[PDB]
Amino acid sequence: MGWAAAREAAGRDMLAADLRCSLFASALQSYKRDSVLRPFPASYARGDCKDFEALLADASKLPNLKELLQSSGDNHKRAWDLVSWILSSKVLTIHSAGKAEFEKIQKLTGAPHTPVPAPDFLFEIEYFDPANAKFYETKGERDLIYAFHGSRLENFHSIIHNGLHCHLSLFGEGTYLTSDLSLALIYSPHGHGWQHSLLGPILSCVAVCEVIDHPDPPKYFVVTNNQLLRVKYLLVYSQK
Ligand SMILES: Nc1ncnc2c1ncn2[C@@H]1O[C@H](C(=O)N2CCN(CC(=O)Nc3cccc4c3CNC4=O)CC2)[C@@H](O)[C@H]1O
């Protein structure tokens, strides 16, 4: 996606654009970047060779999104290229939501049984076709379940773009979900986001999943076929 298209997208929802940059920074900065930074910007790869040192360096030169947008940049050329890539997707996009939807989420997942904190920011994932149509076609007459999934921040760039995978032979294969946000949170410790983020530099992210209902101390449950679920919301918490 081009620079003018990037500037319109970022201007329409800066906190959603900022999140996508913060989640990219978190994956990039992680020692696990080789595996967690997927999708990877092809501009920073030769063949199979990913140049994480070029990418880490260029990432650390990105100004905050207010500065990037207010600066008429042909000098912020490398930054625009990178932010344009970050905010591009033909499959989905992300939308800032108000805590008028945290009420909705709570109603969908079920009233909490244990004290829980309120997210500082909430975000919804909009899926475009064929992906969107495919999900509802798979769903059919079956009703949708809403459950939480906690994870380390460096995993959310890959979780969002590639979806939740199923494994990591051993113990327990499939994705673990819970209707108690207090259980999901123990799997979502604070991680390092982006120093120029409007959300703040240290964040915790919890996913809300749309689960197609099929026979599948707080209670939890496991989803083995990954065609039956998708991240629909993101609960973001900033450390103060
Ligand atoms: N596309 C992806 N990119 C990077 N990580 C991805 C990914 N898709 C899934 N994952 C990540 O894989 C990790 C994974 O398989 N794991 C890690 C931990 N483990 C058990 C476990 O998940 N238990 C478990 C138990 C109860 C509740 C919750 C969890 C997790 N979240 C919860 O809310 C099972 C194997 C996982 O943490 C997940 O968030």
Swiss-Prot record:
Membrane topology reported for the UniProt record: Single-pass type IV membrane protein
Extent of the signal sequence: none
Domain of life (superkingdom): Eukaryota
Residues carrying N6-(ADP-ribosyl)lysine: 107, 134
Regulation acting on activity, per entry: In absence of activation signal, PARP16 is autoinhibited by the PARP alpha-helical domain (also named HD region), which prevents effective NAD(+)-binding. Activity is highly stimulated by signals, which unfold the PARP alpha-helical domain, relieving autoinhibition.
GO CC term (a single one): endoplasmic reticulum tubular network
Domain annotation PARP catalytic: ranges: 91-240
EC class: transferase
Catalyses which reaction(s): L-aspartyl-[protein] + NAD(+) = 4-O-(ADP-D-ribosyl)-L-aspartyl-[protein] + nicotinamide; L-glutamyl-[protein] + NAD(+) = 5-O-(ADP-D-ribosyl)-L-glutamyl-[protein] + nicotinamide; L-lysyl-[protein] + NAD(+) = N(6)-(ADP-D-ribosyl)-L-lysyl-[protein] + nicotinamide + H(+)
Entry's EC annotation: 2.4.2.-
Modified residues (ADP-ribosyl aspartic acid): 34
GO BP terms: cellular response to leukemia inhibitory factor; endoplasmic reticulum unfolded protein response; IRE1-mediated unfolded protein response; negative regulation of cytoplasmic translation; protein auto-ADP-ribosylation; viral protein processing
Family to which this protein belongs: Belongs to the ARTD/PARP family.
Name of the protein: Protein mono-ADP-ribosyltransferase PARP16
Organism classification: Eukaryota, Metazoa, Chordata, Craniata, Vertebrata
